[PDB]
Design a binder for this molecule. Sequence first.
Ligand code: ICS
Ligand code: ICS
Ligand SMILES: [Fe+3]
Ligand SMILES: [Fe+3]
Lengths: 477, 477, 522, 522
Amino acid sequence: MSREEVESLIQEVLEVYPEKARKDRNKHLAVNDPAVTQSKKCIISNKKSQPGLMTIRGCAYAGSKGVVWGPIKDMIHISHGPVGCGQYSRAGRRNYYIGTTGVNAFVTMNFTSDFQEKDIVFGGDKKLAKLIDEVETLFPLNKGISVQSECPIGLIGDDIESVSKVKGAELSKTIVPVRCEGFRGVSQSLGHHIANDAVRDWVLGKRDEDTTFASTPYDVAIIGDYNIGGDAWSSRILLEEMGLRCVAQWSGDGSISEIELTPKVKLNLVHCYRSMNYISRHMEEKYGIPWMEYNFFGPTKTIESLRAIAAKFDESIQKKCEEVIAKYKPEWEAVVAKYRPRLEGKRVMLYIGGLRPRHVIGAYEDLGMEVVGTGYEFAHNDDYDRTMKEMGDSTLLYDDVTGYEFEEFVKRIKPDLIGSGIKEKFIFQKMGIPFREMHSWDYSGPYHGFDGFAIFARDMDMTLNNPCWKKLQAPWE
Amino acid sequence: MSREEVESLIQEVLEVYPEKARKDRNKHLAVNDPAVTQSKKCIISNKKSQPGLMTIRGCAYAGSKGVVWGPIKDMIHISHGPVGCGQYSRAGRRNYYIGTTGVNAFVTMNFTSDFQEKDIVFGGDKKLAKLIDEVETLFPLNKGISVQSECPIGLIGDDIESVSKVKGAELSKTIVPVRCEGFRGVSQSLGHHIANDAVRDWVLGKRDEDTTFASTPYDVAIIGDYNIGGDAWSSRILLEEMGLRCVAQWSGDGSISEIELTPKVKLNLVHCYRSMNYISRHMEEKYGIPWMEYNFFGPTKTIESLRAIAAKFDESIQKKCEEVIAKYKPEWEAVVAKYRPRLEGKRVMLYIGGLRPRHVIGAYEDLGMEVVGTGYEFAHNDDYDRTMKEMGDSTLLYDDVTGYEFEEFVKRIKPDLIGSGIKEKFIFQKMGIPFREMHSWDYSGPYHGFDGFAIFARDMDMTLNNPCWKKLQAPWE
Amino acid sequence: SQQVDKIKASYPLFLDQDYKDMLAKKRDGFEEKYPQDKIDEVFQWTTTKEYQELNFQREALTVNPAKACQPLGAVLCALGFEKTMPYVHGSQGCVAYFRSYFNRHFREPVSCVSDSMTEDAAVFGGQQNMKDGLQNCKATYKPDMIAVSTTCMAEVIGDDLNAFINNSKKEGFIPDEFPVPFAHTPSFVGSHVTGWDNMFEGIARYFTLKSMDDKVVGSNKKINIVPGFETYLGNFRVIKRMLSEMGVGYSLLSDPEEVLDTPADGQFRMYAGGTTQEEMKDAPNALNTVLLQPWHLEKTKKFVEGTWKHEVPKLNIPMGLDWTDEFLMKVSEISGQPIPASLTKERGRLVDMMTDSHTWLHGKRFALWGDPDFVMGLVKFLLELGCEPVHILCHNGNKRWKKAVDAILAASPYGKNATVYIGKDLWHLRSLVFTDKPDFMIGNSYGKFIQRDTLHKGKEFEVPLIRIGFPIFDRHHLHRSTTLGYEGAMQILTTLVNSILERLDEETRGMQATDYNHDLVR
Amino acid sequence: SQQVDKIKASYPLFLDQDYKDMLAKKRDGFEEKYPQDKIDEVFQWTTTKEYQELNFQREALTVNPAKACQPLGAVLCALGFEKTMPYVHGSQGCVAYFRSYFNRHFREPVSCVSDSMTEDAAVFGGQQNMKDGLQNCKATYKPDMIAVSTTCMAEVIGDDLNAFINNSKKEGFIPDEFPVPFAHTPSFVGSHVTGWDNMFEGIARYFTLKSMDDKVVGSNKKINIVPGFETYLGNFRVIKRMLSEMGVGYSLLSDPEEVLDTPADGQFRMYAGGTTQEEMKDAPNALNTVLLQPWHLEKTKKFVEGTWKHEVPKLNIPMGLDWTDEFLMKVSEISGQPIPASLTKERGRLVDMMTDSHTWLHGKRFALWGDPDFVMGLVKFLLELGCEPVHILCHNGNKRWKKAVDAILAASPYGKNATVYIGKDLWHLRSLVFTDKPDFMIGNSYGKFIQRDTLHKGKEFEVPLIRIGFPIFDRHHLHRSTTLGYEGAMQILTTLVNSILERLDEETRGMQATDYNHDLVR
Ligand code: ICS
Ligand code: ICS
Ligand SMILES: [Fe+3]
Ligand SMILES: [Fe+3]
């Protein structure tokens, strides 16, 4: 469907760049073909971003502190370095939790060492030790400390591992050093990798010798669900209604004890492959725990995932799964009947990065909506391997898209709706195109599971069919 | 001082008027002489206003509905006529009460007949009967209905007395017709008289044959205290601390049962002589109940009043009175020590119709403040007789002052502070003179009693020494 | 007892234990109060649908009305002309109430006089009161003009204003050249907006009726603007600003913005600004006359079309996006001035705020009340925002206005749940917000009591009040706001969205219970 | 479960019984949570004076700071110039954070680029990144100027911006005449306002240092205005409007109001408005230069006095009555233009509002925080209103500023109970509002958590928050407000008095318990 016109559009958009940038960016733009299984032959990913082209990517500190470690509610996370880093990431991500903030939970708080000139010149190891003592004095109910390194920590010669070991031995407390300096890697994905390495090396093996936890054949762990707006809770309710027991969830509303208990479960249910596959494979190799990916966006994927998960267990779990599906069928059928006629035929172009862009397509298709373009900030080739069969023919694929590129693509394709982050929202609202934040769910949700599908459909309807979009052109012009 | 200067000021102010208005207004302005105990030879009052001179006075409906009958919490007061009257009078007077509004209390509500053209042309007796039926339907916990007439009721020939009699006999309900049409009289004073007559005729004698109430030798009734900012509460506690029992409270936070129980008390304590002297004299004549005026403005007056009241009973009440005085002495002494240095020597002009300008002067002098001019919109000659001995020599007295007159007097005298109503407040704030709303206590208070004295001193200090009054002149003029 | 270092006013002084014991003793001893169980049962009954059915059968009783009487609006209209004293022929209690009522909401001095008619005037009429009052007012306060309205006393006794004023002039009480326009303003007809209309039509007739021979339409190259009963100074100011931005010659009529916003610099100014007599005299020479609030300016419209021969446009109140656009386009067509780029950018910025706040505004349910033009403009704007007006109440509305609002509602999918009520009071609205609960109320300060009642049923039933309209007595300086034009739409949108967000923060503040949704970013 | 007709988002969906049962089982089974009595005891302990003593002994740990890093302010300053791209040499995560943070505050697009330095640049430097980034940015986004700041990465590795940009020019990556001003903005020194000052000084030095020979002071008859780090558009508007009313020629420098307030009309405008390069080049020809926020414009002051030879006046931020009067008088003295009557009337109207609201404002106790100039202006205005600032916190304040604020407090009887803290964070302020409870807090959105904590102690201990400052994330369109001049003071006074009145209504809404003081009129 106009496959040649898409390639022509790619060439005209690339015309602006200088030769080196154009040659680099040409490999990150592709026209989808569902037949192709190896995405490397068409699109290149996980590369450094070209300087000065206004990328959307973050850093490794965002991927480690912001994404993986931050949702752990009962631990205190120290942004080690200058003040800006923790201030910009304080409570920006909606990883929900239950607790008494400042007493036993510390998710929305910003703990930092706040370096000055003297800390840069002479180092900050003694200051880190004094900070750990002060933390132990003022927050006695904390259950662990992580130290997230910012750029100067790596640049200057600080050695936080020795401080962590000495202070942890002194205080009988778990202190996890994370070398998540923002200049490492090319995006948040290296932050995920570093955070998972720290998890295996400092937390995951505390209870290897412990056998006081009572286990059941129906023990599962949610891995890579960060409870954005309550997503993990909406998934966990469906899992428990199926008869399973969810020992742990990583890492939204997560506790350090849940992480320590994870090696005792029978199955790992991985939601975000991209951020947690590392620890999932490590657990499979070390503990013999199988892991499987699942999708809870939209009723179709939810039912498929529930049936596949129940297939891993005995017949009673399968019967309970059938009961759950039959119980929830009328609700999502009513949601479809109410909202599909008002969204049928609409076209969407979504850039989120990570796992979400190919992972929410089924929900859009459940409402009769077509995804004509999709792309990632920091995905790898395996993510695109899944995406190509997830998307339709002659659609646009794009990795680490620039601001200019995405604006030109949106002008040419003219979608009815765009799903992306906070740094594109207002650009495209001024263009007159409805926009939905997909990282934060526009401060709404959850969208996972059957309960979340209703909210998703309501939100898409309310933004797409908003009467404000018919009023940008003044009547006199 | 300078009595001659004050008389010259009076003459120059009067020069503007036409001959008839000047001749009338000259009788209502005077220079005080404390030795003169006959104010009739010195000042004229309780006369009709001069047309077109922007008077401050209200109407008889305001004096009856707004002042006397309105505070009664368990009765429903129907403003009978067009819609304007009750709407402007709705909840504009801070007559405090305890109750559940709309269920058992109806003080802040506006019940009205809302006449249209057809009601004016054909009458409103049938409408009044249907209205009373609807009131009984929708407010079953009301304990009585009063019908306050507005101007057209008296102008068109409506017989509300017969409707009240018929409907009250039909429903076993107390229905009190009040002919308080605004065109009767010259001010709110005739409204007071009419309301007291209605109380005497329809409510007061309902329990004359009843003897089931147990009476004590220490039974008193507070008459003429309308609980502005909880003023009557702050008095009542003192009376209850002296050992007396307060059976009734006319009419702030009052109930119809208290009014009916009033003829069983041993003493009547009248606060406002102007609005309740009529019923006090009637009850002395009919029941042999003595009545006495008291004053709870400022520590000196309240101590004197408590001693005088206790002198009416036996020695135990006197002992309790001395105990109360001793208990409250340190608090008002501390108030004086804090606030007299801030207010010593300041001069005040007052203009409130009725008892408050004479009553407040003792509280003002307790803080070392001099009252240099005072006046009442509706006071009779008996009120002025009481006033002349309480004011200093060669001070200004003025009855039913016009806006022009009061503005010129203020410009010449230049008081430090002015206490009047809401229709003078912004005029004199724009002139740069601190102003206190005496009728509403500037939405503050209470000012009665020992507890009220502290609030009074704090309010006077906060307004008189406000840093805003030093900033009306811009630096470049 | 008081602590001199921390003195308590009535709240929370009367929450002390001694006062509580006193009040309990008083209630138990002498009030004969109904048992609390019976009180609770009766309140619960009053929040039911059966009570609502009884309440809506009322024919004679009005409880908590949402309107005033004509002379208040007449006084407001008279205040809009230069050095004009509002003069009210009748009883002085009316003038006391009008002045107090305007003083509370404005927080500014209001000048108005009465001739103080009494029983004697009720028997023989008010000729002498009129003569002496006019003489005294002119001598004392020195106005350039005296505008005369009436109280219900004078209307019922049938005082002839024209004859009284003429007899005053022929007998030398006031000079024959002194302008004394008059209007009959009966309080048992219409409401305060009707009084504003009557007063304005009287003044315009007085200055133009007998001098129409030399008037040519469009000769002065201006447009007349008649605002109507208006209590937001920002509305006058934004009309003037938008007209000046387009380079349009205009003549605002009955504008009081200066006299109600005088500075505090050590002197009292009784008069300030206002439409001049020359402006009123030259008004028939304008290109056209625009009525900002046509649904209570019908008599003025009749006079302007029949006498001035101006073809008055059919414009709604310039509220919201579409109606402001229509008003500006009509002004441009009448005057021939193009709409400038500054207004286009202002419109775009309003649209930008709409797209920014739509996710929080969408689907919210509102009950609202006020005057007809204001109500219909607010309903139109709410429909533009994707909100749901559920209970629309106008106590002083009529049947034609109700059909117009129904037509507006039918043009949008968001008006499907709306019902319009005319001739209903705030007790009706209390029943409505109990039985069919909206998200918010929009109205004047009298709504606060309704909010209190809903909170008594429970926190989950409380309907917050948003103060837009007249009068507002329990907040300071909200009369400086704007509701007309793009600026007014921006202010209203900000108020609405931040009320929604403030309520959301209130509902999610409980630690470990609901604060999981206590988001930093909204 | 969901009902299709009334769908529930997270609140109150997760208040359902099944979700509560799920969460209870999760907590009791796998969270190993401390018992609720222990949690309550520790929380009560953190509200005590002993905990406060421990809290203020902190030396290494910072909890909940109230400041950001320099490049954020550098980007804000760069955005104020015509067709200028903010370019941040260093790591890209910094730029992502800056853009998202400004997007959440202003709800507008924020354009900024980086050269995306990685581990390779940590040992070889960022020359190649600078060359390629400048070439790419100029080719793609077509700026007229590129303003370069630094992240802490580049600052630690000691990248030489001047050499890098010169080498980029001499090897043909960018034209030699293309303006590329630069500034070193180390995040471990100062805060975001320091970054603004550094960026502005770099731009001014780039455009004026090498062309001072032909410059004559006062030849263009204008006054330069330097606003500093400012996040209220209304402040720029009010400064320009006041200067235009006086008829005073002026040249605002680094003003971003247009690019942060572009309309939604169907196109995206990356650039709009801003200070032109010609204005910056002609700035030394002005009569004088006024610094609106002198306490974070120290380096700019040194440059302007040393190089441009302007006698910069000693002026406070024009906040509140006295300081605005001093600013207006200084401008009149410099320019020779008398103060017009419109500004005199505006000042009088502000004074009138002060007199109207003084009874409700008097004696109220405020804790407050923010940037130094804004904090001191707010403290000055609060003293003018008769209010009592109790806890004054400025995380990025210094000792000289603290001495100045102490001098201001000692000049008023209302500053007797005030304490000024510098270098303290919002956890310190939480201890302060627990142990010495004020009536209200004034600050940015981060204060909401503090309010939540106090409400957890009790309703009688809750300290409401008033959102004035930067950033505000949980309300919409407050960035359009004004806090400068008589118009700015009017808005602040209205917000304060109405917050007080709204709290009072909340406290007296209880039926038959506290509603005796629920007055219609306030
Ligand atoms: S962790 Fe990843 S960018 Fe898998 S860094 Fe990012 S809360 Fe995205 S597409 Mo923000 S790999 Fe989670 C993500 Fe996906 S922060 Fe969230 S929405 S499913
Ligand atoms: S009743 Fe009278 S005008 Fe005696 S009509 Fe008036 S609540 Fe005044 S001086 Mo308002 S004779 Fe009471 C009065 Fe005094 S309403 Fe109050 S303050 S003590
Ligand atoms: Fe005022
Ligand atoms: Fe925006």
